[PDB]
Amino acid sequence: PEPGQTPIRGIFKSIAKNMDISLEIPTATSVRDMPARLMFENRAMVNDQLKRTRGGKISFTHIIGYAMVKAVMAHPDMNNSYDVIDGKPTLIVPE
Amino acid sequence: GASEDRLAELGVGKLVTITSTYDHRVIQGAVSGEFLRTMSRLLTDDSFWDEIFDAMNVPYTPMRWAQDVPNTGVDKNTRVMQLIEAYRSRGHLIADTNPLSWVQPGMPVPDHRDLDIETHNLTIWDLDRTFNVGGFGGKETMTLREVLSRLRAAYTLKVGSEYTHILDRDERTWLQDRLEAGMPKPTQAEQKYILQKLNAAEAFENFLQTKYVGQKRFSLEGAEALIPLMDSAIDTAAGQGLDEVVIGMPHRGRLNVLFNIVGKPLASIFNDVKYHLGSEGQHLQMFGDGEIKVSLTANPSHLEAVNPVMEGIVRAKQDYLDKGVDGKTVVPLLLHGDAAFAGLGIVPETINLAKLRGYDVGGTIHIVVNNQIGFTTTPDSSRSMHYATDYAKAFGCPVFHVNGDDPEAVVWVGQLATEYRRRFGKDVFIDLVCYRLRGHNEADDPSMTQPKMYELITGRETVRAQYTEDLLGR
Amino acid sequence: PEPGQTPIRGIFKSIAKNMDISLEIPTATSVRDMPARLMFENRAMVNDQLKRTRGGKISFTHIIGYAMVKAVMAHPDMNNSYDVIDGKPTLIVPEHINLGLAIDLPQKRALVVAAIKETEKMNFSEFLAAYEDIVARSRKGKLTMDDYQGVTVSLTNPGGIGTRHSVPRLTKGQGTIIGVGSMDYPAEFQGASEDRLAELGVGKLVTITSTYDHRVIQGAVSGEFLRTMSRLLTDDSFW
Ligand SMILES: Cc1ncc(C[n+]2csc(CCOP(=O)(O)OP(=O)(O)O)c2C)c(N)n1
Ligand SMILES: [Mg+2]
Secondary structure: OOOOOOOOOOHHHHHHHHHHHHHHOOEEEEEEEEEOHHHHHHHHHHHHHHHHOOOOOOOHHHHHHHHHHHHHHHOHHHHOEEEEEOOEEEEEEOO | OOOHHHHHHHOOOOEEEEEEEEEOOOOOHHHHHHHHHHHHHHOOOHHHHHHHHHHHOOOOOOOOOOOOOOOOOOOOHHHHHHHHHHHHHHHHHHOOOOOOOOOOOOOOOOOOHHHOHHHHOOOHHHOOOEEEOOOHHHOOEEEHHHHHHHHHHHHOOOEEEEOOOOOOHHHHHHHHHHHHHOOOOOOHHHHHHHHHHHHHHHHHHHHHHHHOOOOHHHOOOOOOOHHHHHHHHHHHHHHOOOOEEEEEOOOOOHHHHHHHHHOOOHHHHOOOOOOOOOEEEEEEOOOOOOEEEEEEOOOOOOOOOHHHHHHHHHHHHHHHHOOOOOOOOEEEEEEEEHHHHHHOOHHHHHHOOOOOOOOOOOOOEEEEEEOOOEOOEOHHHOOOOOOOOHHHHOOOOOEEEEEOOOHHHHHHHHHHHHHHHHHHOOOEEEEEEOOOOOOOOOOOOHHHOOOOHHHHHOOOOOHHHHHHHHHHHO | OOOEEEEOOOHHHHHHHHHHHHHHOOEEEEEEEEEOHHHHHHHHHHHHHHHHOOOOOOOHHHHHHHHHHHHHHHOHHHHOEEEEEOOEEEEEOOOOOOEEEEEEEOOOOEEEEEEEOOHHHOOHHHHHHHHHHHHHHHHOOOOOHHHHOOOOEEEEOHHHOOOOEEEOOOOOOOOEEEEEOOOOOOHHHOOOOHHHHHHHOOOOEEEEEEEEEOOOOOHHHHHHHHHHHHHHOOOOOOO
C-alpha cells in the first residue's frame, strides 16, 4: 500500500488553499443555451476587415466578455459579494 | 456527423451554453436568470453589433438576426437574381471608397434597401442554401454566401464602379467580367514599388512646404496617391506601345507631377509662373522595354479652360503621326478638382466632342482629385449630382471611385482605366476620393467654416505612413 | 479600497442564514429532458374551455406540480429527509406531502417558500384551488407563520425567465427540491420556421432537475422519480 506522495507547493498550494476556503460559499448554478449563429457571422466580418487592413483577430471570448460587462451594468446585483463585517452578514457593493 | 447542406435545409443554428455560479446569500436565482437572458439578447442585438463594428472600424452594416422565413408561395431564386442586379448597379453606394468616416450634411442620401438581403425575403439562414443564379460567375447554381462574397469582392471593397448604364452589351459585359474576376493579390515586389513611389511623393511635398514660402495653396497632402495613379496609367500606356501622354491639370500638385511624373530635374524646376508653363519629358518602364513621351500643357488660372485646348493638342499630334482608326497613340490624361468638374459647363461641353469625326482622340483618361471641398464650399452647395464625376453617365462611360488611402487599389484602377481606353476608344473617369490637409491658402483656418470635417483630417497618418504600418501588421 | 457596505437585514438575513446551514447537506443533482408537446396541446384545450365558460387560466406549473405529487406518491422515498435524532443518523418519514412553492415576492424582490399542505389527498381541482390560495395570499401579504412551516418537498420554476436548467440549493428539513426549466425549443432551433420544424417532427421539451440529500435518497430512486414525471406528462390517464 505505497502510492507516490509529493507535497503540493507554490502556485498549486495557493489554488488548493482557495478551493478549501470556497467550501464556505453556498452556491447555485444557472444554465442557459444561446443562439450563436449571428456571433459566427459577425465575428467573421470583423476578422475579414482586419486581415485586409493591419492584421489582428478578435475571439469569441472578446465578444462574450464585452457582452458580460454590458449585462453586469444592466443587472448590478451580479457584481456584489458577501462578507462578515462587524460580525454581521453584509452586502459588498464594489466601486 | 451531419452534412452542412442538410442542416441548412432544416435551419439548425450554432449555440453557446453559458453558466452562472453565484453566492446565494446575496444573489437570487431570478436575477441570475435575467442576467443570462440579457446576454443571449445582446449576442443577437442590432445595437450591440453596431457598437462593435464602430469600434473596430468595419465600414459595413452587420448581419441581422431574423427568423427563417415561412414557406409560402414566394420563390427565392428569382429574388437572388434581383439582388445580383442591385449590387451590379448600385453596390458602389456602400463601398469603402471614403478614406474619412465622413457623411456630408446637406447632401441627400438615396435609399438602397435593395442591397439588403432582408428586402428580397432572404435571411442569414439562406447563406448556406443553394440557389439558381442564371449563369452568374459562369455557374448555374451557387450558395447565397458565395453570391455575396463574389458581389462584395467585385463591388463593395476599395473600388466602387458605375457601369450598368452603358448601352452596348459587349462593352458592359467586358467591364462586368473583369470586375467580378476581382482585384489580383499584389506581389511583394509590387508592394515595394508602390511604397517607393509614395516615399517620393511625400518627400517632395515636405521639401516644397519647408524650403519654400506660400505653397500651402499648392499642397498635394491628403492626395499623395495621385503620383502612383498617374504613373500607373502612363506606364500601362507605354506597355501598349503608344507614343505620348499629354497632361492637362490645375495648380494643385503641379511641381510634384513635374518631378515625379514628367521627370524634370530639380534644378530646372527651381530657379507662380512655373505653375502655368508647359513642359516635356520621358517615361521609361522599370518592368518592361517601352518608352513614352510625357507633355504638360500651359493654362490660365481659370479652372477647366485647358480641357478643350489639351484635347486639340492631342488631335494635332495624332494627325501628324497618321496611324488610322486603330492608332490614336497620344493619350490625353486630364486632371480636375471636384468642385470645378461638377460646376463649370466647359467640362461636359468638351467631353461632347469625344466621339465626333473631327475631334476624336481615342478617349480621354479623367482623374478627379475629389478632396470633398472647394475653397470654403462643401459638395452640398457645389453640385446637384450624387458623385462629382456623374457627367460620365451622360456620355455612356464607366466610372471608378477609388479610396485614396489604399494605394494598391489606386494603381489597379489606373491600369484598368487605361486598358478600357485602348479597347473601346471612349472616355474613362477616375474619382480619387481623398482630402485636403491644409487650408485653401496660407492665411485660412479651414475649421472656421468646416470644423466637423477637419476633426477627422487633423493629426491622422499620411497615406505613406498608414500603408507602411498596414503592410507590417498583416 | 472602499466599496459599499450595507448590512443584510430582514427576510434577506433569513435567506442568507439558511444558505449557510444548507452547507451541511451533501447533495447530488439528476437532470432529465422530457417531451412537452402534449402538455402544450392539452393545456391549450383546457384554457380554451375556460375562456368560453367562466374565465380562468391554468399554468404549466399547475400541471407539473400535480404530476410531481403523483410521482412522489409512486416513489415515497422522495418525500423523506435526514436528521440527527438521539445523536444517531435517522430517516424522517413525514405524514403528509406538503409541497413548497417558491414564490418571488415584491419588495418595499425576495424568493420565499410557502406550503400547499396535505397534497396526497387532493384531486387536480382541489390542488389548483390550494395552489391559487397560496399565490393569492402572498400577493396581498396575508400569509401566516404556519404557511412557511412543514415543507416536505419543494418546486421552483427558473424556466419562466428562460433558464434551461439549474442546480439549486436544498434547505434543511427536506429531502429534495425539483426545478422546472425553459419550455422553449433548444437554442439551435430558435431561429427556424415552424413549417420546417413540423416537417422534421421537432417537439417542445422541458428540463426537470432533482437535487436531493444523498444520505437518505439514492440516485436510482431520483432517476425513477423523473422517469415517472416524463411518463405522466404524455399519459392518457393523467390528461
Ligand atoms: C473659372 C474659375 N472660377 C473661379 C476660380 C476661383 N477658384 C480658385 S480655386 C477654386 C476652388 C477649386 O475647387 P476644386 O475644383 O474642388 O479644387 P481643389 O482646390 O479642391 O483642388 C476656385 C473657385 C477659378 N480659378 N477659375
Ligand atoms: Mg476640391
